[PDB]
Amino acid sequence: NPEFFLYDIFLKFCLKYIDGEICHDLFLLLGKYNILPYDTSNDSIYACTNIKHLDFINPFGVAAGFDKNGVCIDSILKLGFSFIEIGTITPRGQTGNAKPRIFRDVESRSIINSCGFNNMGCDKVTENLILFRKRQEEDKLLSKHIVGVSIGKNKDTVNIVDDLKYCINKIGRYADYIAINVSSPNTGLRDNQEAGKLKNIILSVKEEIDNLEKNNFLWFNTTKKKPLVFVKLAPDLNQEQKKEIADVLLETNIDGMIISNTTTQINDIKSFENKKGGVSGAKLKDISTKFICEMYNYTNKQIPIIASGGIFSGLDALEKIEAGASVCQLYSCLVFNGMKSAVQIKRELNHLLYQRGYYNLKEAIGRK
């Protein structure tokens, strides 16, 4: 498709002259007017994957934080992705921290951000998602595409369980899966990663979803089933904390763990020396991949893993898969590679699996 080529003409210009968050706003604006390219290709049946009975037509989606409000789901999915995680959303809208709060380092292909859960609130985002689902009833390019919702707490909230229960009762019907975000470094959130607190949070979320069904058509999503429950983990933990959390995740029978969110322990990027927030991009890959391996070993391979962190090429994706991941999420790749992220990474992964001696992608999950 020549449209990806035409777009890459402006990528370096964007990185050099346009503020990052403004670049992101431009991205969403172009997609709102249905001007982004379309991935016209066909996905390899040998590259599909799944988490429980949630089936992904390909192993690549957009991570949370990119379309925080679901204003652009169709166009982002039609770039070539199989799923998108909208959010993180909160019961009421928040403006976030003061701008600029996103900083890029092109040399290291890394980003640091302190957004602060800026979003339009659960009500407006629920409206946007209902409209998308109506369009999806007709759009054949969007058939079988998955939409997940990441939910969080408002800054000035003490009871996280309240905020998450409001969101579930509002938008749960419309989501294929729900991602619990207790790993953002820019809001008392990583405190909720304490084993006991986390176990209560998870079991509460999973009860509010089950309660949606007890009160009797219902599931207005892609799967026609109740949404699965994922947990997004921060990588800034010691082995003891990782073992305890893995026990909690197994005890609550969550459906998947997203490894991982941004990290605050990177300090070989001189450009970010004076900045605060979580770091993402190529500098997070090795940290993120190792974290997958640990949790893959700690949970006895019983919890599917959604990989997130420094995935730019099919080789990185295969690293994640061969570490224990079943599906991959992109974010920084879209920042530094433009619209072609999905098409290019699908092409490369397909070639890799065909050459490395794999009948299909699911055969590569695990394999150390």
Ligand SMILES: Cc1cc2nc3c(=O)[nH]c(=O)nc-3n(C[C@H](O)[C@H](O)[C@H](O)COP(=O)(O)O)c2cc1C
């Ligand atoms: C500007 C920005 C905003 C983000 N917002 C969220 C968010 O709201 N919720 C969330 O779970 N992760 C959020 N993330 C983390 C990403 O979803 C992803 O986990 C992380 O960037 C690592 O992936 P990557 O290396 O491909 O960028 C955000 C990341 C960035 C850079």
Ligand SMILES: CCOC(=O)c1nn(C)c(Cc2ccc(C(F)(F)F)nc2)c1C
């Ligand atoms: C949250 C962090 O987002 C960013 O900082 C960011 N930076 N760039 C260059 C991009 C990709 C991009 C955006 C817009 C355009 C276009 F306007 F040319 F179309 N091309 C590429 C993003 C996203």
Ligand SMILES: CCCCCCCCCCCC[N+](C)(C)[O-]
């Ligand atoms: C439309 C028949 C099913 C009724 C209940 C769910 C409706 C939600 C429609 C979302 C789009 C789903 N799909 C499979 C058509 O792409």
Ligand SMILES: O=c1cc(C(O)O)[nH]c(=O)[nH]1
């Ligand atoms: O989960 C999150 C949230 C934010 C933010 O909104 O600031 N940033 C991240 O890096 N991860």
